[PDB]
Amino acid sequence: PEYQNIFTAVQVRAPAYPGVPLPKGNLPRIGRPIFSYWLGKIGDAQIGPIYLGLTGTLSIFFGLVAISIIGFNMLASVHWDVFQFLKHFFWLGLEPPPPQYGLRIPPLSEGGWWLMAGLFLTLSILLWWVRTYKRAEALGMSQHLSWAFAAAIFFYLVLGFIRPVMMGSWAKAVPFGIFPHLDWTAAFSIRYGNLYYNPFHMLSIAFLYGSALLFAMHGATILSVSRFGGDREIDQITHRGTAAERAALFWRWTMGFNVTMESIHRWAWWCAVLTVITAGIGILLSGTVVDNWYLWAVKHGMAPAYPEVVTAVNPYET
């Protein structure tokens, strides 16, 4: 047997770190940090403090309004009956405006709340993007997080905003609800002739699977060399240690090639980012360019053919 470094067996405590000092113009952080013993079994025990300037304050306000408009309409849809709200929660949703209204602002009683929730969540997310940018700037760090976040925002924007406007109707955006947004996902594939045959859907899957592949590989690799301090990747990158050396040789010996302690995080960065880049393109092309992905795949010679063992007379021909 051996220690697997999954749980911290013996936690130590020190007075909470208030954070690296930020340049003038940043607001003071807020909150008195607390320690969670149980969070400390799997990771860092400190919770807080937090930074909250104008960007994040504006972001949270937009976001609370958006979330409440959704919940209010969910509760209204079971006539304020809290017990039925809990019964039906996973089924409830806030529905996009009917197609008859196009891209015009629809009535409060029939779609106006969705558009307001969509506007304010979108602004809330865009302000959160600025927050990720500013927090790196104040620490003197490069902008990799905000670049990756922008890729996720791109996909989010394509789903609910760019494509509906291109298609001339808010009715083609996504409803706010757990199971309702799953209906939207399945119905979208049905309507557009089977999303499996969308090549950017295929790529997005390759990269989503690859993210789990790469984090399983990297996550597992680092814990196996954490006995050599391999989790301390900053100093393994500047001052290659036997942690970084043994990690590369494990993979070199397994599959014939390897990366570095720094560059695995580039592979990881791009794999995750390409998941949502290709997803946005795939949705951006659906309805706007390709109306039936299967027939598009047939046209370019991709669709498999099978021996005919079932077949049906088309009653519309007869």
Ligand X SMILES: CCCCCC/C=C\CCCCCCCCCC(=O)O[C@H](COC(=O)CCCCCCCCCCCCCCC)COP(=O)(O)OC[C@@H](O)CO
Ligand Y SMILES: CCCCCCCCCCCCCCCCCC(=O)OC[C@H](COP(=O)([O-])OCC(O)COP(=O)([O-])OC[C@@H](COC(=O)CCCCCCCCCCCCCCCCC)OC(=O)CCCCCCCCCCCCCCCCC)OC(=O)CCCCCCCCCCCCCCCCC
Ligand Z SMILES: COC(C)(C)C/C=C/C(C)=C/C=C/C(C)=C/C=C/C(C)=C/C=C\C=C(C)\C=C\C=C(C)\C=C\C=C(C)\C=C\CC(C)(C)OC
In the annotated binding site for bacteriopheophytin a, the residues are 128
Q: Which residues contact 213 (CB under 8 A, 6 or more apart)?
A: none
Binds ligand BPH by CB under 6 A, chosen from 220, 242, 291, 300: 220
**Token output for 81:** 């009956």
Minimal CA–CA distance to 276: which of 183, 225, 185, 201?
A: 201
Binds ligand X by CB under 6 A, chosen from 11, 27, 34, 252: 34
Q: How many CB atoms lie within 10 A of CB 59?
A: 21
Shortest distance, CB of residue 13 to ligand X, whole angstroms?
15
Interaction residues for ligand Z, span 133-172 (CB under 6 A): 156-157, 159-161
Kindly report the CA angle at 188 between 182 and 194, in degrees rounded to 5? Answer: 115
Which partner, ligand BPH, Ca ion, Fe ion, none, binds residue 212 by CB below 5 to 8 Å per kind?
ligand BPH
Residue 106 and residue 178: Cα distance in Å, rounded? Answer: 23
- Concatenating the DSSP letter of every residue in 61-87 gives HHHHHHHHHHHHHHHHTTTT-HHHHHH
Which partner, ligand X, ligand Y, ligand Z, none, binds residue 78 by CB below 5 to 8 Å per kind?
none
- If you compute the radius of gyration of the chain from its CA atoms, what whole number of angstroms results? 25
Shortest distance, CB of residue 244 to ligand Z, whole angstroms?
40
- Within 13 Å and on the Cβ side, how many CA atoms surround 21? 2
Residue 172 and residue 281: Cα distance in Å, rounded? Answer: 16
Q: Give the residue at shortest CB distance from ligand X.
A: 31
Binds ligand Y by CB under 6 A, chosen from 90, 147, 196, 215: 147
Residue 111 and residue 15: Cα distance in Å, rounded? Answer: 51
Stretch that binds ligand X, among 48-56, 93-101, 185-193, 261-269 (CB under 6 A): 48-56
Helical axes 199-224 vs 263-285, angle rounded to 10°: 160
Say whether residue 70 binds ligand Z (CB under 6 A): yes
Binds ligand X by CB under 6 A, chosen from 18, 28, 31, 107: 31
Residue 217 and residue 118: Cα distance in Å, rounded? Answer: 38
With CB under 6 A as the rule, give the number of residues binding ligand X.
7
- Closer to ligand Y by CB, 115 or 272: give it: 272
- Closer to another protein by CB, 115 or 152: give it: 152
Say whether residue 241 binds another protein (CB under 8 A): yes
Shortest distance, CB of residue 223 to ligand BPH, whole angstroms?
12
Say whether residue 212 binds ligand BPH (CB under 6 A): yes
Residue 114 and residue 176: Cα distance in Å, rounded? Answer: 8
Binds ligand BPH by CB under 6 A, chosen from 27, 139, 213, 249: 213
Binds another protein by CB under 8 A, chosen from 10, 108, 312, 313: 10
Beta bridge partners of 24: 26
Residue 128 and residue 63: Cα distance in Å, rounded? Answer: 10
Interface residues toward ligand Y, by CB under 6 A: 126, 129, 142-143, 147, 150-151, 153-154, 157, 206-207, 210, 256-257, 267, 270-271, 277, 280
Interface residues toward ligand X, by CB under 6 A: 31-32, 34, 47-50
